[PDB]
Every structure is written in C-alpha cells, then in structure tokens.
C-alpha cells in the first residue's frame, strides 16, 4: 500500500523511500525543454514568439526578456546532453523549431540544411548516451511568415504546411526518433494566443485587450483549436501511413489539470467542475477519442463551435499512439456566468466556471506553486494528488491510453541569487510529491504511464515570464550561459534515477 503526502512537509526526497526502482524497469525518466525557450534565434528564421515578444514586449515577461539568445542551446546543445548524461536520464523531450529547418514556413520554399544538421547532431549525441528523444514538432513557435500570410492556425492552410513540415522531420530524423509529439498543450494557443492574447500571436477581441492587432476572443479560440486537431490528425495519419517502417509512436500533448468543486456539497459547483473537465480536457480528448466535441460544448458554444465532416471525424478520432500529458496543477471550480453577448466575451467563459486555488471554506489546495507580486490573491498552489486524479481519469474516460508525462515542474523566483537558486528544495518537494502519486496511480489504477519528463532541463526563457522565474533542474547564469549546473533538485533527481 503506497501512501503519498499532499501537504508540506514532504519526505519523498529520500531516495531510500522513493526512487526509479519503485517504477517498472523500462520506465523512462528525463527532462524536457522547447526550442524557442532554449536555442536562440541564431541560425533560424523568425517565428511568432519572436514576433509577439518584440511587438508586445510587456507581454513577453516583466523584464521584457525573450528567446533571442536565452541559454544558447544552439551553441551549447552538447552541454544539454552533458546534463542528461549526468542525470543518467533515459529520456529527453525537446522541440524542433520549424523556423530553424524551414525558415520560410512552406517546405517547397526550401529547407535549412544547417538547421537539419543541428538537430541530427543533437539526436545522435542523445542516442550515443542512451537517451530516448521525445521530439515535439510544434512547441508554439510558428514561422512568422505563416502567421502573416494567413494568420497561422486561424486558417485551414496551416494543415498542409504543418503536414509538409512534419513530413520533413520524419524523413530526416524518424530513423532515430521514435517518439513524436505533434502540437504542444493543445488548449494553450487557442485560449492564450487567440482568447486572452497573453501568448503569441496575441489576437483577441478589441475590449478584451486593446493592444491586440486583431481577433475575436469568442470565436477564434474554437477555430484555432479545430485547425490544431485537424493539422495534428493529418500529421499522425501521414506518420502512420508513410513512416510506419520507422517503428515509432506519435501523439499530441495535452496540458492537463484536475478540477475539484469549489464547494463539494453544492451541486452548481459540482456541475461547474464537470463542465471544466469537458471544456478543458474534453475539448480535445473528445475529438481525439470520438471524433466529436463534448455535448456540453456543442450545446453551449452552438454556432461558434466548428463541425467535423465525417472524413475529418474519422481522421481525428484515434489519431494518437500515446498521449503526452503535461501536468502542473489543479483548480477548484465554481459557477460563473457566460455573457455571450458582452463585447469582452471569451471562449474561456463558455465553461461557465470560475477557477480558484482556495475552496469555499478557505482551504488552499496545496503548497505554493507560483507567487504573484501584483496580486497575492492570484498566487497559484499545487496539488500532488492531481496527477493521480488526472491519470486515473484518462484511463477511465479516454480508453486506457499509453501516456508519457511530458512536463511536470515548478518555478523559483528569478530574484533569488545563485546560492538560493541552487538550493531549490521546493522543487525537490514538488517533483517527488508528484512522482509519489504517479507511482501510486500506476500501481493502484493500472494506468499505462511509461515515462516522466520533468520541466525543465535548465533555466530558460519562460513564456510570459522572461527570465523572472527559473524552472530548471540545472542552473544557468544569464551573464554567462555556457554552464548548466545541477541544482539540489537535479542532484536529487540523479539519485532518484540511480539510487
């Protein structure tokens, strides 16, 4: 009988009690990163995260930082492999920057052979060290040219451009890469990129944010989500029909959260909680498992929800070999009005829920996850049991998928100095408390989870936050980015992996 802690203090940092041996022999342990966040712009074309951060610098982060040079994994990819080697990691999730290998967006315009070599050297070097690549095709960094030609995922033209790009990756790397992710966190771009405009490309309704250059927060998140699902499904079909000889697997990435009722004896809060599961998870998992959106979405969103043709439904349904599930935290849900007529309406209001980290009787859901200066009431708190509830829900509701936890991690303030940043005990607590529950749900519920990749390999540019927070298990000095030094969390993880 496995017992896991939900509340500080945690004791799962002791590798006597919890380590990789607790898991099956073949279970993959590693870390993750993404191209925009680590590589730098050297050697690649420009993408909408360059566009967005440069046009709207106050949305790139409070320090206006961006991915221009960041930790320069373009130059220092070997140092990233050295961190993985030191961890004795068996997996590394990284993304290919579309702009690095097809700077002009559309493949017929030519490929950047040097960009293709960069990823060949990286993939080799990982394989030389026994590290299994999990490669994300699209971690949000859409070539700027496509956003300017037809507004990227707002237009069905993205489907063939994304397909041709994916085809080049499979052809160039698929002999060595056996685990592909199509689109990172399906929920994020539609909502943050086209709904609240916190993220690239930064489209939204005029009264949601006057700085958006265009958009409609009420309709575009549904259009973009729909094209994501079709583009993803066309790539998975290309992969399974044309690259089956490579003997690899492909899946989408979901951002997952669990949801609990803000008041667990109030039927309206219970209803809001189940609506959140459908609107947050089901928006994508319903198409991915059934070829259709959830009924509550169909009913609420009405004419703003696109339909799949029969052919499209069939393409999308079952379009994965596994699911890359990212998990960070859980929210309480209470009812909220859905003012579909307000000029500031967003797709996110359609769920009819308000999300918090404190429930009706004042209980905070768990330990601090992220502090906010501009609003202490806007702090995020985490919930280790959330990973157990998510995995169990995916096995039960979504047909017992093969899962890899493709991100899980926590930030520490960028204010902290080097010695404080290195002593990141809060990160050990976050990681181990989640790993405890993950082992617990695999053993108790028999969820088919086969790996875990902590976010992040090293400190990097964090979307929306610049360099004001750090997520790395290894520390990077922004005055001299060459080194990646294992923090206490990375040293703990090294011992967890090889106890």
Ligand X SMILES: *[C@@H]1O[C@H](CO)[C@@H](O[C@@H]2O[C@H](CO)[C@@H](O)[C@H](O)[C@H]2NC(C)=O)[C@H](O)[C@H]1NC(C)=O
Ligand Y SMILES: *[C@@H]1O[C@H](CO)[C@@H](O)[C@H](O)[C@H]1NC(C)=O
Ligand Z SMILES: *[C@@H]1O[C@H](CO)[C@@H](O[C@@H]2O[C@H](CO)[C@@H](O[C@@H]3O[C@H](CO[C@H]4O[C@H](CO)[C@@H](O)[C@H](O)[C@@H]4O)[C@@H](O)[C@H](O[C@H]4O[C@H](CO)[C@@H](O)[C@H](O)[C@@H]4O)[C@@H]3O[C@@H]3OC[C@@H](O)[C@H](O)[C@H]3O)[C@H](O)[C@H]2NC(C)=O)[C@H](O[C@@H]2O[C@@H](C)[C@@H](O)[C@@H](O)[C@@H]2O)[C@H]1NC(C)=O
Ligand U SMILES: *[C@@H]1O[C@H](CO)[C@@H](O[C@@H]2O[C@H](CO)[C@@H](O[C@@H]3O[C@H](CO)[C@@H](O)[C@H](O)[C@@H]3O[C@@H]3OC[C@@H](O)[C@H](O)[C@H]3O)[C@H](O)[C@H]2NC(C)=O)[C@H](O[C@@H]2O[C@@H](C)[C@@H](O)[C@@H](O)[C@@H]2O)[C@H]1NC(C)=O
Specify binding-site residues. Answer: 37, 54, 68, 139, 184-185, 257, 328, 455, 462-463
Q: Which of 244, 361, 377, 480 binds ligand Y (CB under 6 A)?
A: 480
Select from ligand Y, a copy of itself, ligand Z, none the partner in contact with residue 22, using the beta carbon and a kind-dependent cut-off of 5 to 8 Å. Answer: ligand Y
Summarize the annotated binding site for L-ascorbate as residue ranges.
Answer: 185, 257
Q: Is 303 one of the binding residues for ligand X (CB under 6 A)?
A: yes
Q: Is 46 one of the binding residues for a copy of itself (CB under 8 A)?
A: yes
Q: Is 56 one of the binding residues for a copy of itself (CB under 8 A)?
A: yes
Residue 296: DSSP 8-state: H
Strands 28-32 and 253-256: unpaired
Q: Which of 88, 290, 336, 448 binds ligand Z (CB under 6 A)?
A: 290
Q: Which of 5, 6, 43, 464 binds a copy of itself (CB under 8 A)?
A: 43
Q: For residues 88 and 85, what is the distance between their CA atoms, to the nearest angstrom?
A: 5
Task: Give the phi and the psi of residue 315 in degrees, each rounded to 5.
Answer: -65, -45
Q: Which of 217, 224, 228, 168 is nearest to 195 (CA)?
A: 217
Task: Give the phi and the psi of residue 356 in degrees, each rounded to 5.
Answer: -140, 175
Select from ligand X, Zn ion, ligand U, none the partner in contact with residue 303, using the beta carbon and a kind-dependent cut-off of 5 to 8 Å. Answer: ligand X
Q: Is 420 one of the binding residues for Zn ion (CB under 5 A)?
A: no
Tokens at residue 120, please?
């060949």
Decide: 107 and 151 in contact? Cβ < 8 Å: no
- Considering only residues 336 through 375, tell me which ones interact with ligand U, judged by CB under 6 A: 360-361
Q: For residues 392 and 264, what is the distance between their CA atoms, to the nearest angstrom?
A: 20
Confirm whether 407 is a catalytic residue. Answer: yes
Q: How many CB atoms lie within 10 A of CB 149?
A: 15
Q: For residues 429 and 410, what is the distance between their CA atoms, to the nearest angstrom?
A: 10
Rank residues 68 and 148 by Cβ distance to Zn ion and give the closer one: 68
Q: For residues 390 and 327, what is the distance between their CA atoms, to the nearest angstrom?
A: 8
Q: Which stretch binds ligand Y (CB under 6 A): 40-48, 138-146, 237-245, 381-389?
A: 237-245
Q: Which of 108, 244, 265, 309 binds ligand U (CB under 6 A)?
A: 265
- Considering only residues 8 through 37, tell me which ones interact with ligand Y, judged by CB under 6 A: 15-16, 18-19, 21-22
Q: Is 344 one of the binding residues for ligand Y (CB under 6 A)?
A: yes
Buried b (16+ CB within 10 A) or exposed e, 310-322: eebeebbbebbbb
Q: Is 218 one of the binding residues for ligand X (CB under 6 A)?
A: yes
Select from ligand U, Zn ion, ligand X, none the partner in contact with residue 334, using the beta carbon and a kind-dependent cut-off of 5 to 8 Å. Answer: none
> Closest separation between CB of residue 242 and ligand Y, Å?
4
Rank residues 40 and 458 by Cβ distance to Zn ion and give the closer one: 40
Q: Is 178 one of the binding residues for a copy of itself (CB under 8 A)?
A: no
Q: Angle 412-416-418 (CA atoms, 0-180°, nearest 5)?
A: 105
> Closest separation between CB of residue 266 and ligand U, Å?
4
Residue 8 burial by CB count (10 A; 0-12/13-18/19+): exposed, middle or buried? exposed
Q: Which of 76, 86, 117 is nearest to 100 (CA)?
A: 117
Q: Which stretch binds Zn ion (CB under 5 A): 1-9, 66-74, 183-191, 312-320?
A: 66-74
Tokens at residue 140, please?
């949000």
Q: Is 263 one of the binding residues for ligand U (CB under 6 A)?
A: yes
Select from ligand Z, a copy of itself, ligand X, none the partner in contact with residue 418, using the beta carbon and a kind-dependent cut-off of 5 to 8 Å. Answer: none
Select from Zn ion, ligand Y, ligand X, none the partner in contact with residue 145, using the beta carbon and a kind-dependent cut-off of 5 to 8 Å. Answer: none
**Alpha carbon 276 to chain centroid, angstroms:** 18
Q: Which of 307, 400, 415, 498 binds ligand Z (CB under 6 A)?
A: 307
The radius of gyration of the chain from alpha carbons, rounded to an integer in Å, stands at 21
Q: Is 414 one of the binding residues for a copy of itself (CB under 8 A)?
A: no
Q: Which of 167, 266, 392, 483 binds ligand U (CB under 6 A)?
A: 266
Q: Is 211 one of the binding residues for ligand Z (CB under 6 A)?
A: no
Q: Which of 68, 117, 124, 171 binds Zn ion (CB under 5 A)?
A: 68
Q: Please report the sign of the dihedral spanned by the C-alpha atoms of residue 379, residue 496, residue 256, residue 439.
A: negative
Select from Zn ion, a copy of itself, ligand U, none the partner in contact with residue 265, using the beta carbon and a kind-dependent cut-off of 5 to 8 Å. Answer: ligand U
Decide: 70 and 476 in contact? Cβ < 8 Å: no
Place of tokens 């969820």: 447
**β strands within 63-150, DSSP E:** 91-95, 132-138
Catalytic residue (choose from 39, 151, 312, 407): 407
3-state secondary structure of 336: coil
Decide: 157 and 226 in contact? Cβ < 8 Å: no
Site string for ligand X, 319-348 (x = CB under 6 A): ------------------------x-----
Q: For residues 284 and 225, what is the distance between their CA atoms, to the nearest angstrom?
A: 8
Q: For residues 258 and 235, what is the distance between their CA atoms, to the nearest angstrom?
A: 28
Select from ligand Y, Zn ion, ligand X, none the partner in contact with residue 68, using the beta carbon and a kind-dependent cut-off of 5 to 8 Å. Answer: Zn ion
Residue 62 burial by CB count (10 A; 0-12/13-18/19+): exposed, middle or buried? middle
Residues in the site for a copy of itself, rule: CB under 8 A?
41-46, 50-51, 54-57, 68-69, 103-105, 109-110, 112, 143-145, 148-149, 213-214
The residues assigned a catalytic role are 407
Residues in the site for ligand X, rule: CB under 6 A?
205, 216, 218-219, 263-264, 303-304, 343, 359-361, 363
């Amino acid at each position: 009988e496995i017992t896991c802690q939900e509340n500080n203090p945690f004791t799962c940092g002791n590798t006597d009690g919890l380590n990789s041996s607790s898991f099956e022999a073949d279970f993959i342990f590693g870390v993750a990163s993404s191209a925009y966040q680590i590589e730098g712009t050297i050697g690649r074309g420009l993408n909408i995260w360059d566009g967005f951060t440069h046009r709207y610098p106050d949305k790139s982060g409070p320090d206006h930082g961006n991915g221009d040079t960041t930790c320069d994994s373009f130059s220092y990819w070997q140092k990233d492999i050295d961190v993985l080697d030191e961890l004795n990691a068996t997996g590394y999730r990284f993304s290919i920057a579309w702009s690095r290998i097809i700077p002009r967006g559309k493949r017929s315009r030519g490929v950047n052979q040097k960009g293709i070599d960069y990823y060949h050297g990286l993939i080799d070097g990982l394989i030389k060290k026994g590290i299994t690549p999990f490669v994300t095709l699209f971690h949000w960094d859409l070539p700027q040219t496509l956003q300017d030609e037809y507004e990227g995922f707002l237009d069905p033209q993205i489907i063939d451009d994304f397909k041709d790009y994916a085809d080049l990756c499979f052809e160039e790397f698929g002999d060595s890469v056996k685990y592909w992710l199509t689109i990172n966190q399906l929920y994020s771009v539609p909502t943050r990129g086209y709904g609240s405009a916190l993220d690239a490309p930064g489209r939204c309704s005029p009264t949601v944010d006057p700085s958006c250059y265009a958009g409609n927060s009420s309709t575009e998140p549904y259009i973009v989500a729909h094209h994501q699902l079709l583009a993803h499904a066309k790539v998975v079909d290309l992969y399974r029909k044309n690259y089956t000889h490579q003997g690899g697997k492909i899946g989408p990435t979901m951002i997952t959260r669990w949801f609990l009722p803000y008041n667990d004896t109030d039927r309206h809060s219970i209803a809001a909680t189940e609506r959140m599961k459908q609107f947050f998870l089901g928006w994508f998992m319903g198409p991915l498992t059934n070829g259709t959106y959830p009924q509550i979405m169909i009913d609420t969103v009405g004419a703003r929800l696109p339909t799949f043709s029969p052919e499209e439904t069939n393409l999308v349904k079952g379009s994965y070999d596994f699911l890359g599930l990212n998990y960070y935290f859980t929210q309480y849900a209470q009812p909220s009005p859905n003012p579909v007529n307000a000029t500031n309406h967003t797709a996110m209001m359609d769920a009819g829920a308000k999300l918090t980290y404190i429930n009706a009787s004042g209980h905070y859901i768990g330990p601090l996850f992220e502090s906010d200066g501009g609003d202490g009431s806007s702090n995020i708190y985490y919930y280790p049991k959330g990973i157990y509830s998510v995995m169990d829900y995916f096995k039960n509701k979504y047909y017992n998928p093969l899962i890899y936890v493709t991100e899980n991690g926590i930030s520490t303030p960028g204010s902290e100095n080097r010695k404080e940043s290195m002593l990141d005990y809060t990160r050990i607590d976050y990681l181990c408390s989640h790993l405890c529950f993950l082992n617990k749900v695999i053993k108790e519920k028999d969820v088919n989870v086969k790996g875990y990749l902590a976010w992040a390999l090293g400190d990097n540019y964090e979307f929306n936050n610049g360099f004001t927070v750090r997520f790395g298990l290894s520390y990077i000095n922004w005055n001299n980015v060459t080194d990646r030094d294992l923090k206490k969390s990375g040293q703990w993880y090294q011992k967890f992996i090889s106890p």
